[PDB]
Amino acid sequence: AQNPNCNIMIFHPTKEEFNDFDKYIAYMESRGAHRAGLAKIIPPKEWKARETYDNISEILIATPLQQVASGRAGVFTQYHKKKKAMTVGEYRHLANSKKYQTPPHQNFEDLERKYWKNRIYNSPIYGADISGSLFDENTKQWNLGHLGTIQDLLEKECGVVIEGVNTPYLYFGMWKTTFAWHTEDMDLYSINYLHLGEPKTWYVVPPEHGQRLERLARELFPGSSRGCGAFLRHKVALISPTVLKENGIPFNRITQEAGEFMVTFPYGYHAGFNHGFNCAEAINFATPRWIDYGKMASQCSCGEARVTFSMDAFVRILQPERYDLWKRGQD
Ligand code: NI
Ligand SMILES: [Zn+2]
Secondary structure (H helix, E strand, O other): OOOOOOOOEEEOOOOOOOOOHHHHHHHHHHOOHHHOOEEEEOOOOOOOOOOOOOOOOOOEEOOOEEEEEEEEOOEEEEEEEEOOOEEHHHHHHHHOOOOOOOOOOOOHHHHHHHHHHOOOOOOOEEEEEEEOOOOOOOOOOOOOOOOOOHHHHHHHHHOOOOEOOOEOEEEEEOOOOEEEEEOOHHHOEEEEEEEEEOOEEEEEEOHHHHHHHHHHHHHHOHHHHHHOOOHHHHOOEEEOHHHHHHOOOOOEEEEEOOOOEEEEOOOOEEEEEEOOOEEEEEEEEOOHHHHHHHHHOOOOOOOOOOOOOOOHHHHHHHOHHHHHHHHHHHO
16 A cells, blocks of 8 residues: 555656566556646657657647636636637747736746636637647657557447547647546546646546545535536536635645656546647556546536547456446446
């Protein structure tokens, strides 16, 4: 029972330890990293996702989303308004303009205070959920497009490809661009690499305390709780760290810099924001340990959020001795 305080652990793999992705995930879990819900991984010195980040200005952001928030005192609901297509070059210019740029700050505590206090103002534009990857095909270690985990069973056994789940998503962010409180689809793991730019702050609740966050969310959004039994699947709730601390919700905060990986573990609730212009890439993955989490993931009741995929192939192939038991439990 390592990591008793559910601290966010930072890992420094050697070049050799960076070869087998699944093996390093298991090593991190042997150290209790998953208890925090998130871990940071610093890649070895000479490792690189790609040679250079030139020629990225021409990338198409077909549907940038304006993230409109409404609320106050650290509790907000966010909705996405569709905007017209832009290039990464135009987006970077907009992010670095006087209206959207990172406001002056003394330190993190000051920037964090400005983000939570002024959230309803100057609704940021997020170049989120773009199908694609910036990892060079030559990169053979921790290439998000080719992690080689058991999640490959979805496409291998069923021919099912879901954008962002088993294919990478690119995210071009700007100051105040936000990711609302959520666990991954099917309570999968996720991995995020910050290719370039300004930091990304993450808030994370330890998986053992996930229900405490759900209880607080039900009390903060009573209308949403009456309509859906898993409304955090909607991914629209913003809850500040001050509100978490006031309500005794255990959490940790860590900031991710460019060149660093962040891994989220099954049922690790997380939320955060981008400090300024940046580009991150993310994808889901799975291990044999996740199958029990996937089998029990609470799904959206109202239909606003999807039931991403069936657990059938995973149970039938990787837990065959428990397949009939799983089937009887599904009715
Ligand atoms: Ni996530
Ligand atoms: Zn719902």
